[PDB]
Amino acid sequence: AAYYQVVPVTANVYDSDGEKLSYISQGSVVWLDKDRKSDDKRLAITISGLSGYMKTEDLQALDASKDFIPYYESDGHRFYHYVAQNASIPVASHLSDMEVGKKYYSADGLHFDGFKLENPFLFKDLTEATNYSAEELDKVFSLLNINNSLLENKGATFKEAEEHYHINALYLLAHSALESNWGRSKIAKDKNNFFGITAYDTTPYLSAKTFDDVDKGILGATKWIKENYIDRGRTFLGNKASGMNVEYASDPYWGEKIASVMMKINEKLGGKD
Ligand SMILES: [Ca+2]
């Protein structure tokens, strides 16, 4: 088969030495890499920029004529990644080289046969501050019709987190937007945890960290990200090959999803970043 689906809750991706490089989520589709040797026990595969090996035990072959395979498609305005049959995210602007309504296939979401994507937020150094002020970040809730969010009017706590910990506030807003549904998840409301901290794939809600209030959740999650990711040399969102996505989340498109939110906010606030 050309495509394989991850069967267990998560599965490891290994190098040729058998060392763990990362892990990916149940349902993830990986591409068979025909330039490298596969055997009975391990397949050479690619996923979200990472070229390695997976145990055949963890995979199920798909048939692309009847099973969903992730793909990218232009509407003539934005290029979308279909990350699941019924969910698309906008990743870039339409390039004149894209045929409208044609499905395109890419292992990194950057290199395609007939064009290449800049996804600048995906690789943007997150220690650089946003050019958006507290008031500009706060205007995004109306501009995107975000209702009943615990993060409404917290632009000032985000810019404080950015001032004190040197982490990009537009990135902190986008990450909390994705992980907690803009501060509307049960974890968001119960534990002021907006970033999915220690919310492990095996038991996400049980292992989720508790913060005392919304402001301490923003500042406390920022301190955690700084100490566990930024300070250990994970300084951009990235994918399964590099950046925070190697270890932060099983979802191979976690970084792409956060970049997509940064892109949408940036566009609605006037393009200052
Ligand atoms: Ca090695």
DSSP-assigned states of every residue in 120-149: HHHH--TTSPPS--HHHHHHHHHHTT--S-
What is the rounded CA–CA span in Å between residue 18 and residue 123?
28
Give CA 156 to chain center in angstroms. 25
What is the rounded CA–CA span in Å between residue 261 and residue 237?
12
What is the rounded CA–CA span in Å between residue 166 and residue 55?
40
**Structure-determination approach:** X-ray
What is the rounded CA–CA span in Å between residue 168 and residue 120?
14
Could you list which residues have their CB under 5 Å from ion ligand 1?
15, 17, 19
What is the rounded CA–CA span in Å between residue 21 and residue 52?
8
Domain boundaries, the chain: 1-65, 66-125+237-273, 126-236
Angle at 195 between CA 13 and CA 243, to 5 degrees: 40
Sort strands 3-6 and 10-14 into parallel, antiparallel or unpaired: unpaired
Facing residues of 6 across strands? 59
The resolution, in Å, is: 1.8
Specify the residue for token string 């794939």. Answer: 201
Ligand 1 center from residue 47 Cα (angstroms): 18
Sort strands 50-55 and 20-25 into parallel, antiparallel or unpaired: unpaired
Question: CB-hemisphere CA count at 13 Å for 245?
Answer: 26
Ligand 1 center from residue 17 Cα (angstroms): 5
Ligand 1 center from residue 16 Cα (angstroms): 7
What is the rounded CA–CA span in Å between residue 194 and residue 218?
7
Residues with Cβ < 8 Å from 271, sequence gap 6 or more?
none
Residue 253, SS3 per DSSP: coil
Q: Is 95 exposed, middle or buried (0-12, 13-18, 19+ CB in 10 A)?
A: middle
